[PDB]
Symmetry: D2
Subunit: 397 residues, 4 copies
Amino acid sequence: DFYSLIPSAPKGRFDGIERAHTAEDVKRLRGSVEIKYSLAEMGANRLWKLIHEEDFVNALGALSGNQAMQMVRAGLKAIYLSGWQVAADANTASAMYPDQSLYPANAGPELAKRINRTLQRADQIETAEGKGLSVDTWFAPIVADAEAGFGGPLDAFEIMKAYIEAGAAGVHFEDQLASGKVLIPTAAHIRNLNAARLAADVMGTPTLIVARTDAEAAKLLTSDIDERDQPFVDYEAGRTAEGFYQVKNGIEPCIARAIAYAPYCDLIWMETSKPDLAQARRFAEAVHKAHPGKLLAYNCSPSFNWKKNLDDATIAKFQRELGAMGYKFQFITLAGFHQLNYGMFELARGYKDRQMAAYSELQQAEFAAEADGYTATKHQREVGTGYFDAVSLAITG
Amino acid sequence: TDFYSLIPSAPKGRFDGIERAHTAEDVKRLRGSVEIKYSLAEMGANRLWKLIHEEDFVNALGALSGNQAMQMVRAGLKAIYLSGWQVAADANTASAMYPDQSLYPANAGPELAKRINRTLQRADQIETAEGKGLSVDTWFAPIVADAEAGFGGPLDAFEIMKAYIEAGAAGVHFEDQLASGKVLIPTAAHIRNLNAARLAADVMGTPTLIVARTDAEAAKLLTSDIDERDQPFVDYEAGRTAEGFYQVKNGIEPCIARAIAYAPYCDLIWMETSKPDLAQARRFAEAVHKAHPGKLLAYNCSPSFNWKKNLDDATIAKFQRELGAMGYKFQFITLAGFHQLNYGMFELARGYKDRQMAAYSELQQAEFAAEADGYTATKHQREVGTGYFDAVSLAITG
Amino acid sequence: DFYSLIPSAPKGRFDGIERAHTAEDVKRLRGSVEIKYSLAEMGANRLWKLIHEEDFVNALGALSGNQAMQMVRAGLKAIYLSGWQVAADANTASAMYPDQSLYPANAGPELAKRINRTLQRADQIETAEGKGLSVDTWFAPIVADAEAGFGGPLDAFEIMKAYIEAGAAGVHFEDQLASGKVLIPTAAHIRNLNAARLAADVMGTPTLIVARTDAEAAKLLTSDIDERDQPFVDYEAGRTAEGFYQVKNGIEPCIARAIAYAPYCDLIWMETSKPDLAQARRFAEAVHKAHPGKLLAYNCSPSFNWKKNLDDATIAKFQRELGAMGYKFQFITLAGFHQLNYGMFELARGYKDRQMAAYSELQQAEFAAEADGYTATKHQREVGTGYFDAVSLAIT
Amino acid sequence: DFYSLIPSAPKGRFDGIERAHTAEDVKRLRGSVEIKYSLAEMGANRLWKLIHEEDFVNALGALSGNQAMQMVRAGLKAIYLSGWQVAADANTASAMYPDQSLYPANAGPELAKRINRTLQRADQIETAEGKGLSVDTWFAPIVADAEAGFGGPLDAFEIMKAYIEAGAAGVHFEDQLASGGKVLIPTAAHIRNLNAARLAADVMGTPTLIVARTDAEAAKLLTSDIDERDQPFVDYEAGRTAEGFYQVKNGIEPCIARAIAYAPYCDLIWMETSKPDLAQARRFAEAVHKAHPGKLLAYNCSPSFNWKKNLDDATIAKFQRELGAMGYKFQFITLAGFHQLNYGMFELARGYKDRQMAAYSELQQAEFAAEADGYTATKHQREVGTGYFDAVSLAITG
């Protein structure tokens, strides 16, 4: 009956998915006209295929259309769009921000739109050349950061709709207040999740919803109104000057919240500062007890000192291991940011020292990378000169 | 001293050898009734003027983003280049990937300048809040920005110049091609564009630098033969193309002719070159200097030129200092940010596909290694201003 | 063939239309994936329907989504989007501009997008209330100004696509180099028209193309290269100081240009600052001689002093008469600008004079208009408060 | 020491104003470089002058630069910028919204910039014509809606800085969680927001006015009872709702309490009200002045309130004049632009559907008739800068 309102949804896309609202609600609220969202449709269905067919899907956080394109060119199957990086350097306020939802709510979707436009141009370049594609598809699904929705359920409703028009495949939402960390009631985050599903239903796309819990670390809670949160409340503490409740953090409230969110999302993600295969299994097992086979997601922290804290062999198997535990979507949130910043610092350092010699090093690196499939050395082609040549050529009589 | 009167922040000798088509009285008519200050435009302009009259040369890289620009300034570079090609490539207001014509909206350039300056501003705020002084000479390295052909006629050039000033660009370049090989405009048409940009600078009250660029080295076409200075270069024996364009002889001769013609009307002169040649650069420099002695010159180091194959390590190594000695005081690699961004992500992504976390660890380790040489972005919260905003939060709560 | 590549095109949509490019050219340049553009299809098809079935379609230039919404609510069947107004009060440089394509080239499509979102919201409000729509449709087709395409053929390609993505139904292109008026060669404007058509084909939508000529008043021409323009050049004069050619303006070059442009557009428009049924007739009849039944468009000048220059009977019948001659799309370009500025000047004048009394005058006027279909007095409902109440209720 | 940080602040600007942060906090937090913000300086200072000099300063909600232009032209001395209107027809999400802080934080400052740019042009036009200005100043002060600050103190800190860069003169902040009816935040949470605003203005080094708004009149909910200043109004019998909100008693009493609490932390106080009543405004005015004598107040004249039905024409006629005597110095109609725009276009469109060119001719004759009262928009292309840009062209060419 919902499969009817969402034409492109594959069979059993909504297995085990509960909704607060009805099919009649969707029809009341969708408008009288059918508008299509092709990339959102394709991306979401490709993401659904991938997470069920692959060992696991790993992604990196892209700061620009160009970064995303290179990711896809290199053979990655999905793209991650990070809020931290949006705040850092890809931003509608045009400012550098800390990760606190400081930028305007339209900034994520705007990046997703940019990414898709670069992928579209890459697709057009190769299609015009007529030798076939050099990747499986240029439209690798985008999974994107919606933060806490930027307000209440309607803000989450709006931010979901915007990601859909931009052409994102999946979108994640977290149970912190945004402003260390402060949690909102379980009930409250289920409200946001439901808004996001309603938005998707209303757009007629089977967009993926990721639920994120920030309960591992958060020692604060807005309100004890929800009976499910009360076991973690240190009532004897008691409230803070801001009126927040003091809370018991760790894996146990993460498990309880994940279990509560499971019917309302397509993947579950426990935010973790400290990568640990044993904790990962712990969490996975607990969740699978109450919801067997539930798709899980995992952030591989960019600030964790990988080599210091784990042996090389464990680093090498980390993602393979996570996948076999049921973490089907894995990503490094700040990969683009680190890569961009490091690369240019080293380019700019050597250019101060030895000028044109520094750049020659870069160029020779690029040339060597061609055998591996790097093409951006042919920079005019990369950007679509030969594509617009052909356009000019077709226009002429 | 009437133009010095109107641009308060101009240093002594700023407008020496510079001719204007308008009067100071024209400025006062077109200025509005209210003085509006553009601090970053002033500061960038005066710091750029100073640097090009003191360093043996100022070199710059083309920055695709604010973070890229920051690392440039942190690394010790003194100026930032903002490339039109790169804007079209990965940073425009149509959110599209474009080839290098002028397909993107005219505001795209000035919007990047503003982005770049806002990043620098934040890096400055962070270090100022830490209270131990700056790790750089200044976070606000002057920005020299591509305006293409001005996006139409002299009024479009007027407008983009103003937009760049409000964004806090220090210098802006203008080229004598149509945008539609390359098709030049008449010499006089391009002088009109440069005058538009100076009237814009004068109306805003800023000593903003104006770079004139000539595309005559490679261009075989010219819109109109109306200008008697361009007439010698026309092959009237062709005669005109289906589009009505005139065939023209390219090379160094027309670059010299135009450059000398453009000289009284700009601050720096630039000949677009595809094949870097110290001898051909010496030619152009000398020829221009006979007509205009000590004239500031700019030079583009082609990113596509295969440096290793065409030159020797010694020639490559000396290349930039060689040009500085000739009088090429501003040198830049246009597409450096593009090549770095793209190469870096392809290699990381390739490695991450092959061996997942092992590939990230390698990048991470390289970052740690780089901290000795002055890299700080490994402390990612700090780079981005959370320590600054922590301080902001404390101050509000007493 | 081309109907295969533009799936929503009605039959005979491209009767009489020529193209420089092949169906094969489209396949190569459109990419490997099928991306749909619902609003652009629906707009294009409704407009095509309207201009063939109504006596004439008339429209006013909208400056904002609200303005557009009131047009549709009042019962107008199409919306005009004016470049002059974009320059004036609604561009992406956030500045007030004269009409010389000074603003960034994304500004028009950006407005088109605003208008379509407002109309979408208006449609959601009524759909959620569940009592049917108060209009035939909220998605009145938008005809939009692409100016001179903002450069060359590739610039025109780009702006056409952007308008299609925005949901525009038709787009107009003019043979001037705004960059008084200076014309481009006949063949150069044909190149622009062709680029716009390839953009439509590549996007897979049957978007309407209007060819505008500025030849009535223009006395300058970039180049005499095109033999079709040479009969109008005044070679004695000869060239101006910036290298332009001097041209005999008037209806004759308009006719020649219209006739040459005709196979490459869906509507032809002769730009005029002086509204005149006799001239409108001469143009139409000459064009139909070479191209029977060719759809035409007419701008009804806002600057022209209607009352002083024409009698009331003519003013009253003007659009009706134009319709009968074959002018099936008619608009007033700056209608929104004039309404907006007059309305606020007068409100602000009373408010300075007698404060709250003046607003009450406005408020009462609004209540009176409720009989004719005005709803914005219930301002909360108008903006979507009831729609979002229902959304909230659904979530909980 | 604070006056030293705000160079343009007139003497006695911050009398009776308290701050949580120190002058040293400001110095640490403002970066190492002085950036000026001229329109924000002029606008604030001018606003400050008008509210102390005029009997009262009234304003209308502008939806666009052109609307603001006509207000100034018609003789109005300030401009109000409505958050509701931004949600309606002028935001950066390019969508129509109810006002529940749904549009991106971006949008208000963007409108403020649009308006100031329109006014500059209007000023440029008249200055170029060299016959004096037809107004006291084209740069009428803008007072703008920041809503609930779009989050916490840092969001409020940021939107304040964005409004300053855009050149707003004053900025209001409300004690609701726009994010049953309205929901209030604790008294302490709002004072936090107001302080972040003051800090922002201080860090920018401008004397921007801060307006505190209370929504306690109609608000029947509160996020937390943590602040003992709010506990007198809690209905503890109720008790909490499913979102965990406390139920509260609304009206003039909590408005007075909150107003008094807010008074040291802002420049003007505004009690939001949906029922305009002179006696209640007298009530509120008196109560606040008892604790803070001669405190500047602001008043919103509800556009939704059916005025003619509910009051008599003499009361209507005198309403604003009476409030001004009570100490309501800044008064405004939030949605004036919206109602004018929508009414005008509906009626024009109605007439056009019925009688085509006859309807338009009627408008045009009205405009001609209005020329005697200072209306100039019939002159069409002058209004927009055609004459101005012709003069620029002339300076460049001939």
